[PDB]
């Protein structure tokens, strides 16, 4: 369940990064040495995602990868991205903050996963444009 | 009868030395041949002889017997098990030598009444009319198990120095750590019974009265061997023993368990006990097993926890 929480936080960070086109929040999250820095990023990334939701540029969907998987569609600057997985719940944020209060290592783990998701999606999108 | 197979684990041990060379004390080793895919390999593996175990057993029996008032010989009260071998030994104790063959039994009985160790341990008298008595306890060499494709035994040399203020002080000792296994046999039914044909000689009634006490003492003496009170160099090289597996069988007919060189040697001996009782028309057959390494046991066996319970059940 700890890995599932970390994976859902990583999906939130990856969606926020792909939508904003800025690594700054993921950099802040992966370099955090206090609960203050982690919590500030968790707010700021959700505030970016909230704007994308209100603009209908961020939406939940299902995608067939032959069973349907939960996904998040992100439209940014005319690029379309799809992140596979769920976004964190309020309980996931609270349980993740409790994990951070024990060990800030979990912020680095979530940041490393988020950057991996974003890099793979950006590479695939650039390859399809070149073809 | 009673038969037993026991598995031991010993670390940083030097109990049985051998002839010293230069300024070095060496351990006792034997050659073994191990099978490999490439071929065969000859390896030297430490062992412990079967005489030290007999000496420890006899000393423990002497100590137990002197507490209960059973007769003990003069030279056997001192830990010197020469026994009634030559004329000089008989002179100290005060026993007349046998006259001829026909009187031999009588002599035995007299000896059998003047020393318990000569009865259970056995004795031999050389001379014109020799008399014999086979030991009631049989022990074997202690050799670590040759299981799998690896021998779990080592042997190293340690360097020791004595300090002096006026140098003008160096020695070496061999130490080992192995996984030992050994088996033994005992016949409590033949205790206090003469071993020579003839006519009954006056004095056998005392042996009949003392049979129960002698049997109890002989059974009790196994506790020292099963607890690890054998060998030498215990003052500065006291070892660290531990019990892993133990199988003890009590029957009314000859039988022995399998050697403890394989990982599954209790199921085989239980099946063979059943098969042998089937053919030899036995009546009593009981098996007690102590397991600590978590190997397969089987069904139809009482499981104990310590060695004291085993001795209690054997005596009962």
């Amino acid at each position: 369940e700890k890995e599932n929480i970390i994976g859902r936080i990583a999906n939130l960070l990856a969606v926020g990064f792909l939508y904003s086109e800025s690594p700054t929040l993921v950099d802040r999250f992966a370099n955090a040495l206090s609960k203050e820095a982690v919590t500030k990023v968790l707010y700021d990334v959700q505030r970016i995602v909230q704007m994308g939701i209100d603009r209908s540029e961020i939406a939940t969907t299902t995608i067939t990868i032959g069973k349907d998987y939960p996904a998040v569609n992100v439209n940014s600057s005319g690029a379309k991205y799809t992140v596979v997985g769920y976004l964190p719940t309020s309980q996931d944020i609270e349980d993740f903050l409790r994990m951070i209060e024990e060990d800030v290592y979990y912020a680095r783990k979530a940041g490393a996963l988020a950057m991996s998701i974003a890099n793979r999606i950006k590479l695939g999108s650039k390859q399809s444009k070149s073809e | 009868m009673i038969s037993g197979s026991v598995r031991f684990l010993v670390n940083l041990e030097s109990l049985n030395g051998v002839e010293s060379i230069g300024n070095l004390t060496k351990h006792r080793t034997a050659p073994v041949v191990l099978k490999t895919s490439t071929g065969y390999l000859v390896r030297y593996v430490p062992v412990i002889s079967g005489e030290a175990l007999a000496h420890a057993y006899q000393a423990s029996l002497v100590d137990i017997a002197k507490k209960e008032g059973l007769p003990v010989g003069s030279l056997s009260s001192q830990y010197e098990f020469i026994k009634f071998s030559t004329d000089e030994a008989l002179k100290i104790e005060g026993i007349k030598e046998p006259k001829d063959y026909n009187d031999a039994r009588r002599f035995e009985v007299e000896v059998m009444l003047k020393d318990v160790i000569a009865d259970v341990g056995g004795f031999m008298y050389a001379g014109g009319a020799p008399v014999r008595r086979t030991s009631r306890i049989k022990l074997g060499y202690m050799i670590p198990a040759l299981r799998g494709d690896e021998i779990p035994a080592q042997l190293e040399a340690q360097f020791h120095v004595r300090f002096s203020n006026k140098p003008v002080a160096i020695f070496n000792v061999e130490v080992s750590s192995a996984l030992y296994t050994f088996s033994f046999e005992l016949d409590e039914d033949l205790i206090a019974v003469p071993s020579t044909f003839g006519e009954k000689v006056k004095g056998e009634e005392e042996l009949e009265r003392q049979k129960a006490k002698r049997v109890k003492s002989a059974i009790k003496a196994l506790y020292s061997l099963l607890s690890g009170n054998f060998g030498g160099k215990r003052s500065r090289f006291l070892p660290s023993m531990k019990l892993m597996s133990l199988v003890v069988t009590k029957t009314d007919f000859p039988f022995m368990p399998e050697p403890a060189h394989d990982d599954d040697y209790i199921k085989t001996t239980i099946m063979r006990l059943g098969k042998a009782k089937g053919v030899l028309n036995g009546n009593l057959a009981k098996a007690y097993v102590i397991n600590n390494e978590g190997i397969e046991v089987g069904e139809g066996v009482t499981v104990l926890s310590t060695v004291e319970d085993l001795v209690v059940k054997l005596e009962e």
Binding site: - | V18, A30, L139
Partner: protein
């Protein structure tokens, strides 16, 4: 003529010292094999009156034919000669007609040691049957007498000296008889030798040669 086979598992090995430095033998003599069989019936007694002198409780099984062979590898070491073959297997063949199958089978399960006290040996399985006598060219692994001829290449033969049953009595030395062993000296093992001979009993394919 009935025959019986027994399979023994040795604990550490056997040790028999030569009569007359205490060198030992490579394989047990037939006297020890007969004594081990007789132990099953004469247990508990060490001296019987043969009629003239106390010599042994084994001067009655003297006419039972016995052979034995190895099935593993060992080393002969003097340190009192000993033959270390731990966890090895020994195959012993008894051929006789004095007693019926039942008595020989019962005595076959009652073997406890070969040689001295320390040389314990458990019993795994036995077989009993009726043997047939032949004289044609055969191949054998069991040791035989010296007078038996040989057709194959003399490469794995050794000479030993054994004694008859006359040595069962104390204060008397048995007669010397030469014997040929098909054994490799180092490491210890058994090899097959082809012999013609005059009397050979078939005890299951592994022909046993006696003369």
């Amino acid at each position: 003529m009935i025959y019986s086979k027994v399979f023994l598992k040795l604990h550490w090995g056997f040790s028999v010292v030569k009569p007359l430095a205490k060198p030992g033998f490579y394989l047990p003599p037939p006297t020890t094999l007969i004594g081990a069989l007789s132990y099953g019936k004469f247990r508990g007694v060490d001296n019987i009156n043969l009629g003239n002198v106390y010599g042994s409780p084994a001067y009655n099984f003297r006419n039972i034919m016995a052979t034995a062979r190895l099935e593993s590898e060992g080393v002969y070491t003097e340190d009192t000669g000993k033959v270390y073959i731990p966890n090895g297997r020994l195959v012993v063949v008894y051929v006789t007609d004095s007693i019926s199958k039942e008595e020989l089978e019962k005595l076959c399960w009652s073997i406890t040691r070969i040689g001295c006290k320390e040389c314990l040996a458990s019993v795994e399985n036995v077989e009993v049957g009726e043997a047939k006598k032949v004289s044609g060219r055969v191949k054998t692994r069991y040791y035989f007498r010296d007078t038996v001829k040989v057709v194959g290449r003399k490469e794995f033969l050794e000479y030993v000296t054994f004694w008859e049953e006359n040595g069962y009595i104390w204060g008397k030395e048995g007669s010397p008889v030469r014997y040929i062993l098909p054994i490799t000296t180092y490491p210890l093992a058994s090899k097959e030798v082809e012999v013609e001979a005059k009397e050979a009993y078939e005890v299951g394919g592994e022909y046993v040669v006696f003369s």
